[PDB]
Design a protein around this nucleic acid. Structure first.
Lengths: 120, 82, 90, 120, 81, 85
DNA sequence: TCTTATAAATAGT
DNA sequence: ACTATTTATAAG
DNA sequence: TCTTATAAATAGT
DNA sequence: ACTATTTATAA
């Protein structure tokens, strides 16, 4: 009892097939533009974090060698002082050109005390 | 007279004997220091805890602090055993 | 001794050697007499011309020297030049 | 201990503010292209259903007037038959040129019977 | 002879009297039909259930089917009355 | 003679008398021989006068339900019968 | 390798 | 600050 | 609106 | 079926 129904009705489902895959085309282009944006954001965030890190690393290294130089400033001061007191033993040891050198003691008592207590 | 090697019980006799034998001991050290060209140091603490030292001081003491070899050291008991 | 020799360096080696030994032991005996007779502590250090150490202590060497390191008062200290400036006064 | 962090860290949050509204820009253009497609599909579906209905409605009305004409063909057939038997009453009633008309009956008996049974 | 108005119990007398009075009844209808120019129909069923009819038939019966007015109608009891 | 009465009143009164006598001969035949008789008369003025032996509607309804050969007569048949004297 | 003439140092008168 | 005993010290 | 001369119709012999 | 009675119709 169909006039043109067997053709028009068999055309409708063929139309909504194209409609539905047109929707899948849109939803798939939407997923790839979302992921392409996320990869774009990820590289920008990684570039700025690389910037922040390469600033902190050089600030902390120059502070590290600051501590290192402070240790050298300390050990060099103490080494030069622990030999500065030993230079005072030469102005008393050898000669004062025989003025009044051989009389008494004042600082060699420390050296004598340290040498005696090393009897072990 | 010939006295014995014992503590002088008297105060004044021990005092002036201390002075005279001290000065004579410096003199014997003076003769040895010059005759044989040797350096001598002598440190004396009396019974009254006062210092009396003699040097032929800093140089001799500092030499003694820089010598760690076996050497002759004597004591009062070693003088008795001698 | 037999005849008095002057206060001058003995240029000979053996005479300076034996005189060094005899006068050294006698010097330790006079120090032994004073150490015991008057109850005093005595430390004696002697370096020869050959720079060899010979020492004497009355009671204990380390205890006397350590005492001496802990005494910072005015006191009598003498030298060879002070003995010369003291004996020729008559 | 702050060198440039207090400026670059104040720049970080200003960066991800642009990123986050860029994300909303994307999802908003996604919403409008989805709705613009659904309005596009809705008009295409309405046009084809308008096509299918305007074929059914005019096939069914022309079938309806076919039934209507079939009733006319029947009522006209029965009206022409119910007067066709009444035409036969005239060839017996008025004149046969007086050949041998007044003799007996053969179909007037039905008309007489129907006239008698209507006595109510 | 005179006979009363009663059913003739004889068969042959009822038969021939039926025939003669039937033909005489048609004659009276013939004379009325022609003398007065009137149309008359007569339908008679005998005791043997056979039809005997007279027409001055289809025209008169069809006229009777097309007349629905008050009219004079008589019956056997009306003839007695 | 049996001819149309051209007069109106003579045709009227003769119609009435011959009508009543016609119903009397039918009354005699209906009762004497036990037969059912139906008589329908239309005058020249097209007015109905009828007579029935037992029941008009029953006799007419019987007549509509009988299709056998039978005797039927007409005015011309009476002339073709009485002119054989 | 040390044994006796003379200074060298010391204690009561 | 001293005379009469001890004590060292130097060449056979 | 009808009452009596003559046909009109009919039953046994 | 013919010869009496009996109805039946126009003056």
């Amino acid at each position: 009892p169909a006039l043109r129904e067997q053709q028009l009705q068999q055309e409708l489902l063929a139309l909504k097939q194209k409609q539905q895959i047109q929707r899948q085309i849109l939803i798939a282009e939407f997923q790839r533009q979302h992921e392409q944006l996320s990869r774009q954001h990820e590289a920008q965030l990684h570039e700025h974090i690389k910037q922040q890190q390469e600033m902190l690393a050089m600030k902390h290294q120059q502070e590290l060698l600051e501590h290192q130089r402070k240790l050298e400033r300390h050990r060099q001061e103490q080494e030069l002082e622990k030999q500065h007191r030993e230079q005072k033993l030469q102005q008393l040891k050898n000669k004062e050109k025989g003025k009044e050198s051989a009389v008494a003691s004042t600082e060699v008592k420390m050296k004598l005390q340290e040498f005696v207590l090393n009897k072990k | 007279k010939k006295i014995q090697i014992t503590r002088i019980m008297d105060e004044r006799n021990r005092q002036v004997t201390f002075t005279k034998r001290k000065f004579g001991l410096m003199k014997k050290a003076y003769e040895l220091s010059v005759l044989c060209d040797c350096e001598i140091a002598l440190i004396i603490f009396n019974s009254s805890n006062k210092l009396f030292q003699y040097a032929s001081m800093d140089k001799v003491l500092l030499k003694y602090t820089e010598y760690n070899e076996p050497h002759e050291s004597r004591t009062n008991s070693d003088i008795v055993e001698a």
